[PDB]
């Protein structure tokens, strides 16, 4: 079934609240997570693995920048009545961090803040028309996607997305805001163009289950 949505000015969560919302090994109160972030919480859960052995857990994490944008994460094992242990990871390059909520194991008042990366999306090619003036930058996100791009800070621009089927039918949008979301759609490209300066804007893909 073919069914993309088209959403302009959603923060991140309310993307992936989209992407739950299309399809309408958890411990403990991660059970009360969607399917969508509870994949992303253990990829966390993998990196706290890999930096504390068998059975630890992600719990929290943030985001700082210290030269690269870097995820900082709080992992605990459930046997283990011990002070929570953090591991740092940088963001890959050309990515930057932003965050996300779900419930972590332990708590089940309120999910808890988590860190996740996604492309940095250079806005800087200059155009020229008459005496009006924009930058642009263009992302070829990595079936069907849940695409997520963002302007950085207080600046709205327009958001242009052309995607294709497989059998050659298309859909597309262009309008302005401050972001643009695309659930279930089909593979495409994204521009994004401003008219303030030389900008980024954050991009984040993810295939739609």
Not at 86 to 106: H, I, L, W
Not at 110 to 134: A, L
Not at 149 to 164: E, H, I, P, R, W
């Amino acid at each position: 079934v073919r069914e993309p949505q088209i959403f302009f000015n959603l923060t991140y969560t309310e993307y992936l609240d989209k992407v739950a919302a299309s399809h309408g090994e958890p411990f403990g109160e991660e059970s009360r997570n969607d399917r969508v972030t509870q994949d992303m919480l253990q990829a966390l859960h993998d990196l706290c693995v890999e930096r504390f052995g068998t059975g630890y857990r992600a719990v929290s994490g943030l985001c700082y920048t210290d030269r690269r944008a870097t995820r900082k994460i709080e992992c605990n094992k459930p046997s283990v009545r011990e002070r929570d242990r953090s591991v740092t990871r940088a963001c890959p390059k050309g990515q930057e961090c932003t965050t996300f909520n779900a419930y972590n194991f332990r708590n089940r008042h309120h999910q808890v803040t988590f860190p996740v990366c996604g492309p940095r999306i250079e806005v800087k090619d200059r155009h020229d028309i008459g005496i009006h003036t924009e930058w642009q930058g263009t992302w070829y996100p990595e079936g069907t996607y849940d695409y997520f791009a963002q302007m950085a800070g207080t600046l709205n621009g327009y958001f242009g997305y052309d995607g294709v089927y497989s059998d050659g039918y298309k859909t597309s949008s262009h309008g302005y805001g401050h972001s643009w979301s695309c659930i279930n759609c089909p593979r495409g490209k994204v521009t994004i163009t401003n008219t303030y300066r030389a900008t980024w804007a954050f991009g984040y893909t993810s295939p739609h289950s």
